[PDB]
Design a protein around this ligand. Structure first.
Ligand SMILES: Nc1ncnc2c1ncn2[C@@H]1O[C@H](COP(=O)(O)OP(=O)(O)O)[C@@H](O)[C@H]1O
Ligand SMILES: Nc1ncnc2c1ncn2[C@@H]1O[C@H](COP(=O)(O)OP(=O)(O)O)[C@@H](O)[C@H]1O
Ligand SMILES: [Mg+2]
Ligand SMILES: [Mg+2]
Ligand SMILES: [Mg+2]
Ligand SMILES: [Mg+2]
Lengths: 465, 465
C-alpha cells in the first residue's frame, strides 16, 4: 500500500516515523511548507520516501533551498485558503494512487480529513477534525460528552473577556484556540490585573505566524481552570497532576495504548514524560473512560490521538484537550522501546485495513522498566541561579550533569545539549527554548522521577552574558 | 519550466548540476537506480528538486535505504527492457508536465531520447542516440561523416577477433562497445599473445554489471589504434596526444564551447583535464571541424556533447568517441570557473527554447587563467615505488604533497585524499580506483602541466600492507 504523509513539524518524530512507515508501506511525502523542514528532517524524508513532492511556491531563490538544524516554530507565511490546501492534497493522492493519508502536524489535520473523505479513504472525519482543532468547538463537544464539564466562553475583545471573567470566576484559563505548545496559555487569578493581562497576550498573539488555512470561530477561549488534586491520584511524589494518554481511533472506536506520567511543568511549559504511568489499574481505567468519551465525543473516526487530562479531586478526570495526531517529543518511540509496539505502523495498518489491524485489547502492560524523555530550559537555570535574572539573552558554551544525582538503578541512556557556541534569546517562550535533552531508564518509576528532579536542580550551565 | 532529470552517475557532477538547474528551472528528479546514488548525491537531489521519484522495485528492505559515500560503478541488477524504461520516463514526464528531459548518465541516453520523441520534446534523436551509445554504430557514422576513417569490426567470438586482427593489423584497439571509463579497452601489439588477451578481457567483461536496457549489436569492437603525433600539435611538453571538446547540439547544429587539454594517461586511465586548451587557434579550428562533423554525423539534435579526439600526424583529428552528455569530472564546473558560462543552464535553455538560448558564437576565449582537475591513483604510487609491487591490496592512512613542487605562479586551489583508514583493493581497474584529487590554477598552462607532473611523481602515501 501507498501512504501519503503530509510532512511537517511535531507528532511522532522524523527519526522514528519515516523508517517505521517505510518498513511496511511505500511512502510518498508532501511538504506543504519547505521552510518548516530541518536538515535532519529533510534527510529522513528523502531516505525513506519513494517520492517526495514540495509546494513549488515556497521557492523564490537558492537561499530558499537551505535547511536549518533547528526549527522551534515555522516562521514564514503560508497564505493559501483551506479549500486550496485540500485540493493540493487530493492532487498528490491521486497522482500516486494513495491508499491512505496521514500527518503528524496539528495545522494540517482539518484539510487532510476533507481530502480523505473526498477520496473515500479513512480519516479523522471532516467535522470531527474541526472539533479537534478549534478549542471552543472541542470544549463544547467535551461538555456534551459527559466528562467533567466546565464553563467556557469564546473571546475576541476586551469586552468579551470582561464578560467571561464575571461569568466564569477566578481561577480562569485564557488561551488561544488554534495553536499549541502552551503558546499564549495564561492563568488569570487576580481580578485586578486581569484585563491588563488580556491586552498583553492579545497583542502577543498577532505576532505569531500560522498558515491562513487555520480557521477558528474566536481567537481566545476562556475557561474554568481545572484544579489538580495530586494526592487523590498518586501514592508517591515525583509526577504532576496531569497526564497524557496515547490512543488510536479505528472506525469510530477508541483504542487506548499507553498513559504517560509527567514531571511538573515550568509555568505551562512541559518538562518530561515517563513511559508508562505508575498509576494503579483503577486510576488508569478512569483515565481511559474519559479519553474514550472525549474522543468518541469529538466524532473522530480513524487517527492517532494524544489526549491531555487534569487529575482532579475525587479522581475526576478533567479534559484539557485532545489532538487527532500522535504525541510529540519521544513518547511514541518510547512506547516502542518499553512495549515493543510500533504505534506508527499500527496507525497505518488501521488507515489501510481498519479494525483488521492488530489493535491491542486494552492499555499495554508488562513494562520491563520505565523510560523518561526530559528537556531542560533556560528557565531551569534562572531558577538554579546559574543564569542571572537581569539577562535578556546569552550564548551557550556547555551544559554538564554532575555525577551522583541518580536514584536507585536509574541510568542516563542519552544526553544532548545545545551545541557549544549556540546563541540563546532569553526573552522568548520557554517551550521553544529547550537547551538540553536526556533519556532516563529504570525499574523504579519513583526513583526515575526523583532523578529527573535532581538533574533539573543541579545541572551546570557554562555561558557568557 | 519544468525539467525532468534522470538522476544517475557521471557527467556534470551533482555539486554543480542540481543548483545550476534549479536556479532557473523547476527540477523533478527520477532515480531509476537508487543504489547508484551516493549520500552526497541524494542530499543534492533532494535539496534542489521540487519533486523526486524513485523506482519502487529497487527497495526490498530497510538496508536498501542506505547511501554509500562512494560509488565507482553501480553494483546491483537492473533488468527492465528498454521499452519499459521509456515507459517509466514518459510516465514521470506526464505526471509533472515536464517541458524537458535530461540526463548526465550514458546508460539512459537511448531511452530518454525515445521518450522525448514520444512526448514531442527536444532530445538527442532516437537513432542518433543509438549511434552515440553503440560504438560500432558510432564508428560507422564517423566513417561516413568524412573525418579520419579507420577499419573497424564487430567482435563477439575468438574467431571474429582472429579475423579482425588479420584485416586490421597491429597496432589494434579492442574495447567493449557499451561501457565507459576505459573499461575493457585493450591495446593489441603482439600477434603472438593477441588471442590470449582476447580471452582474458572476454571473461572479464561478463563480470561487470550493466542494466538489461543496454542494447548492442556486438560485445567488442576492434579498430585501428589511432596513433598520436604530439609534436605536430603542441609546442611545449606537459600534455598528451588526445583532447576533449565540450559542446552543445541545438536543433541539429554543433556549438563548441571549450577544448580541454589532458595529462598523459596511465594505461588508458585518465589523469587530468586542463580548462582551456593552450592549442593555437588553427589547431582548435581543426578540432572544432572534426567534432562538428562527428556529432552532426551521428544525427544528434539537442543535447550536450563530450567528444574525445586523438591528435594525429599532419594535424589530423582522429575521432576516439563522442557522448551525448556532459563531460565527467569537474570539466563542466571548470568551464564556469574560467569563463563564467554555465553549460548546464545553457543545455536546459536549449532543451526548452532551442536556438533562442544564448549559445556562444565559437569556442569561449579570454580565459583569465588555466584550471586543472587532477586525480591520483594507486598505480601512481606503484610507479613512485611508494606501494610495493607484490601488493594486491592496502589500507590507506594518509596522502601528502611535498612543498616546493609548483612551477611559476601555479597554486593548489584544493586537495582531497581518500579518508584516513580507507580500504584499497589493488587488483581492480585504476579508473574506479582514484585515491586523491586536486585542482590547480595558474596563468601559465605549461607551468600548470609541469606542476601536475611533479605532484604525480613526488606525492607521499602512508599506508599498511
Ligand atoms: N482548562 C485548563 N485547566 C487547567 N490547565 C490548563 C487548562 N488549559 C490549559 N491548561 C494547561 O496549559 C497547558 C497547555 O494548554 P493546552 O490546552 O494543552 O494547549 P496547547 O495546545 O497549547 O498545548 C496544558 O497542558 C495544561 O497544563
Ligand atoms: N581507436 C583508438 N585509438 C587510440 N586510442 C583509443 C582508441 N580507442 C580508445 N582509445 C583510448 O582508450 C580510451 C578509452 O576509450 P574510449 O573509446 O574513450 O572508451 P570509454 O567509453 O571506455 O572511455 C580513450 O580515451 C583513448 O585513450
Ligand atoms: Mg494542544
Ligand atoms: Mg496541550
Ligand atoms: Mg566513452
Ligand atoms: Mg572515452
Amino acid at each position: 500500500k501507498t501512504v501519503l504523509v503530509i510532512a511537517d513539524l511535531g507528532g511522532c518524530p522524523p527519526h522514528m516515523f519515516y523508517k517505521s512507515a517505510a518498513e511496511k508501506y511505500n511512502l510518498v511525502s508532501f511538504i506543504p511548507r519547505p521552510f518548516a523542514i530541518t536538515a535532519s528532517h529533510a534527510a529522513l524524508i528523502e531516505k525513506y520516501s519513494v517520492a517526495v513532492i514540495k509546494d513549488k511556491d515556497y521557492f523564490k531563490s537558492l537561499a530558499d533551498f537551505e535547511h536549518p538544524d533547528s526549527i522551534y516554530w515555522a516562521h514564514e507565511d503560508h497564505n493559501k485558503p483551506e479549500e486550496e490546501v485540500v485540493e493540493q492534497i487530493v492532487k498528490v493522492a491521486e497522482m500516486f494512487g494513495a491508499d491512505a493519508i496521514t500527518t503528524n502536524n496539528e495545522l494540517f489535520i482539518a484539510p487532510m480529513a476533507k481530502a480523505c473523505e473526498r477520496l473515500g479513504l479513512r480519516g479523522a472525519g471532516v467535522q470531527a477534525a474541526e472539533n479537534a482543532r478549534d478549542k471552543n468547538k472541542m470544549r463544547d463537544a467535551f461538555n456534551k460528552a459527559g466528562v467533567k464539564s466546565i464553563k467556557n466562553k469564546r473571546v475576541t475583545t476586551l469586552e468579551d473577556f470582561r464578560a467571561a471573567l464575571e461569568e466564569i470566576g477566578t481561577p480562569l484559563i485564557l488561551k488561544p484556540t488554534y495553536l499549541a505548545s502552551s503558546i499564549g496559555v495564561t492563568l488569570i487569578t487576580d481580578t485586578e490585573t486581569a484585563e491588563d493581562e488580556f491586552n498583553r497576550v492579545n497583542d502577543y498573539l498577532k505576532s505569531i505566524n500560522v498558515p491562513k488555512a487555520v480557521t477558528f470561530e474566536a481567537p481566545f477561549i476562556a475557561e474554568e481552570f481545572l484544579q489538580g488534586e495530586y494526592g487523590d491520584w498518586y501514592q508517591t511524589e515525583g509526577y504532576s497532576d496531569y497526564i497524557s494518554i496515547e490512543g488510536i481511533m479505528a472506525d469510530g472506536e477508541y483504542f487506548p495504548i499507553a498513559i504517560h506520567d509527567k514531571t511538573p511543568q515550568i509555568g505551562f511549559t512541559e518538562t518530561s514524560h515517563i513511559t508508562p504511568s505508575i498509576l494503579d489499574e483503577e486510576a488508569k481505567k478512569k483515565i481511559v473512560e474519559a479519553a474514550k468519551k472525549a474522543n468518541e465525543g469529538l466524532g473522530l473516526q480513524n487517527c492517532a490521538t494524544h489526549t491531555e487530562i487534569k487529575l482532579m479531586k475525587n479522581r475526576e478526570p478533567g479534559l484539557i484537550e485532545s489532538a487527532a495526531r500522535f504525541a510529540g517529543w519521544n513518547m511514541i518511540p518510547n512506547i516502542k522501546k518499553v512495549f515493543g509496539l510500533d504505534m506508527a505502523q499500527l496507525l497505518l495498518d488501521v488507515l489501510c485495513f481498519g479494525k483488521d489491524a492488530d489493535l491491542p485489547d486494552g492499555l499495554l502492560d508488562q513494562e520491563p522498566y520505565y523510560v523518561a524523555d526530559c528537556h531542560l530550559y533556560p528557565q531551569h537555570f534562572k531558577q538554579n541561579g546559574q543564569i542571572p535574572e537581569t539577562a535578556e539573552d546569552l550564548v551557550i558554551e556547555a551544559i554538564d550533569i554532575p555525577d551522583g544525582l541518580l536514584k536507585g538503578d536509574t541510568e542516563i541512556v542519552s544526553f544532548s545539549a545545545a551545541a557549544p557556541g549556540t546563541s540563546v534569546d532569553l526573552t522568548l517562550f520557554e517551550a521553544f527554548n529547550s537547551i538540553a535533552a536526556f533519556e532516563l531508564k529504570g525499574s523504579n518509576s519513583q526513583d526515575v522521577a526523583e532523578s529527573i528532579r535532581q538533574i533539573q536542580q543541579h545541572a551546570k550551565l557554562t555561558a557568557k552574558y
